């Protein structure tokens, strides 16, 4: 049960530029573990679960933040998507299927499964199916779900394992693109078309960071979320954006950085790899225009290194390899040292 500050330090190693969000999750996750750690429950008071609601843009690190916490404090981690469960037909079997997936990682231990952290994303899509929200709130509020014991050909109702979801931490992530306009209307001037209105759609989205931080329950209901569902998500963490400069840092600053992964692959081959700063801006600029955030970084680097990776093993006398911005464009070939 490390302190919230210690948890934030671990997240800082792999995630950068979202220090404010780390603080909210660090205190929220610390309370959840403290309640689980304080299983004695000497006090007559019954502790209540606190569920977080992540609002951030695509590829901002919402998913990465979930499993990273589990790496620090060993617990099973599973991920789900609202679009998968919007079917609205026999929703009960799929909600319990999620914990079943989580049970696989924890060796089908009910106690371990209860301590696990569950993550969801793309909650904005269901907001408008209204019926889907009716079933989802029950899972967050707490419900006992029966699951078969570690698969098997068949088993009777008696053997079915029942896991209480009240002790499981649920993180309903989402990306509310249109919610920023609703907040500006409520907080800023209610003019968007006239001469005096603010139509500075430069794509910078810097104002969006502090604007989304003022999220209140009123703007969510306008988005279509029912008030009952909002009540079950008291904690709210907001990610601002991943800037072009921030993407450059993510390429090398993380522990298991993308550049380090490729560098290690070349090191064992027998030739080292050097990434010039000029090459970093080209990769970051491409991701910003593509709108992939940090996700596209892996694809852009692989494509640039695909040709050399094919010929470098066959070729010899390449003492060292260097990359520059021209190589990212595709016109140039990675420099080879002899």
């Amino acid at each position: 049960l490390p302190t919230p500050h210690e948890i934030r330090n671990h997240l800082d190693d792999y995630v950068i530029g979202q220090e404010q969000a780390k603080k909210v999750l660090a205190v929220a996750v610390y309370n959840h573990y403290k309640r689980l750690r304080n299983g004695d429950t000497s006090n007559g008071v019954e502790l209540g679960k606190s569920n977080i609601l992540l609002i951030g843009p695509t590829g901002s690190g919402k998913t990465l933040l979930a499993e990273t916490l589990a790496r620090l404090l060993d617990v099973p981690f599973t991920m789900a998507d609202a679009t998968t469960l919007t079917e609205a037909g026999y929703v009960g079997e799929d909600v319990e299927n999620i914990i079943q997936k989580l049970l696989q990682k924890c060796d089908y231990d009910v106690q371990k499964a209860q301590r696990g952290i569950v993550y969801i994303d793309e909650i904005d899509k269901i907001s408008r199916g209204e019926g889907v929200q009716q079933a989802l709130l029950k899972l967050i509020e707490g419900t006992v779900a029966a699951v078969p014991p570690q698969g098997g050909r068949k088993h009777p109702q008696q053997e079915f394992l029942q896991v209480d979801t009240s002790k499981i931490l649920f993180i309903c992530g989402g990306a509310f693109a249109g919610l920023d306009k609703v907040i500006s209307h409520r907080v800023e001037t209610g003019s968007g078309i006239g001469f005096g209105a603010t139509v500075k759609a430069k794509s910078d989205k810097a104002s969006e960071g502090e604007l989304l931080a003022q999220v209140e329950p009123e703007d969510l209901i306008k988005f279509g979320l029912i008030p009952e569902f909002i009540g079950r998500l008291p904690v709210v963490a907001t990610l601002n954006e991943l800037s072009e400069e921030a993407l450059i840092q993510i390429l090398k600053e993380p522990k298991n950085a993308l550049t380090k992964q490729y560098q290690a692959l070349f090191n064992l081959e027998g030739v080292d790899l050097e990434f010039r700063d000029e090459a970093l801006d080209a990769i970051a600029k491409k991701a910003m225009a593509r709108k992939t955030g940090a996700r596209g970084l892996r694809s852009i680097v692989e494509a640039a290194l695909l040709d050399t990776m094919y010929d470098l093993p066959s070729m010899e006398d390449v003492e060292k390899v260097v990359i520059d911005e021209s190589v990212i464009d595709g016109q140039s070939e990675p420099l080879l040292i002899y």
Binding site: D124, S127, R128, G178, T189, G190, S191, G192, I193, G194, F195, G196, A197, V199, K222, F223, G224
Partner: protein
């Protein structure tokens, strides 16, 4: 035929006429000769917007060659009566009544385009009948003239004597001239 525009939100898609879509953004259009019917419509928009939010500013785009004085006073009194600050932007031109409403806007929120033309003159009226009735109507229009000059002086900031001499005859003004005169506060040239 006014075009129809679609507004898309998470709740759904709604269709509005171009004028109604801008009304949601607190934009009221004043066009043509001022009269009781058009003025009444503008008044209803001000009260409706005041109810929705009494803090957000209201915008008024003025392009009109003046009109009835009584109809104009309804708009002017309504603007001052409601809590929201009513901004005024002159598009094309603003004659006697349009200019009075333009300068009547909230201090610091009166604008005009660079090529707009602002003209101010004294009231125009006429009456046919007995001499006794003429004196009654003649006294009324003079009282209206003095009242309008006093209000224009207050908003513009110029002296009452200066406003009387200038408004005796038609006085065409340009956007830069209006700024120094006091009818408007700034000129909107480019969005920056």
């Amino acid at each position: 035929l006014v075009p129809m525009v679609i507004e898309q939100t998470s709740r759904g898609e709604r269709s509005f006429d171009i004028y109604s879509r801008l009304l949601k953004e607190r934009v009221i259009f004043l066009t043509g000769q001022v009269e009781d019917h058009m003025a009444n419509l503008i008044v209803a928009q001000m009260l409706f917007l005041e109810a929705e939010n009494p803090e957000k500013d209201i915008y008024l785009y003025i392009n009109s060659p003046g009109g009835v004085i009584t109809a104009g006073m309804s708009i002017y009194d309504t603007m001052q009566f409601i809590k929201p600050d009513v901004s005024t932007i002159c598009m094309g031109q603003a004659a006697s009544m349009g200019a009075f409403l333009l300068t009547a806007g909230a201090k610091g929120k009166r604008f005009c385009l660079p090529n707009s033309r602002v003209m101010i003159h004294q009231p125009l009226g006429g009456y046919q009948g007995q001499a006794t009735d003429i004196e009654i109507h003649a006294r009324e229009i003079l009282k209206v003239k003095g009242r309008m000059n006093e209000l224009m002086a207050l908003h513009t900031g110029q002296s009452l004597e200066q406003i009387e001499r200038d408004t005796e005859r038609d006085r065409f003004l340009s956007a830069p001239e209006a700024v120094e005169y006091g009818l408007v506060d700034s000129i909107l040239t480019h969005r920056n």
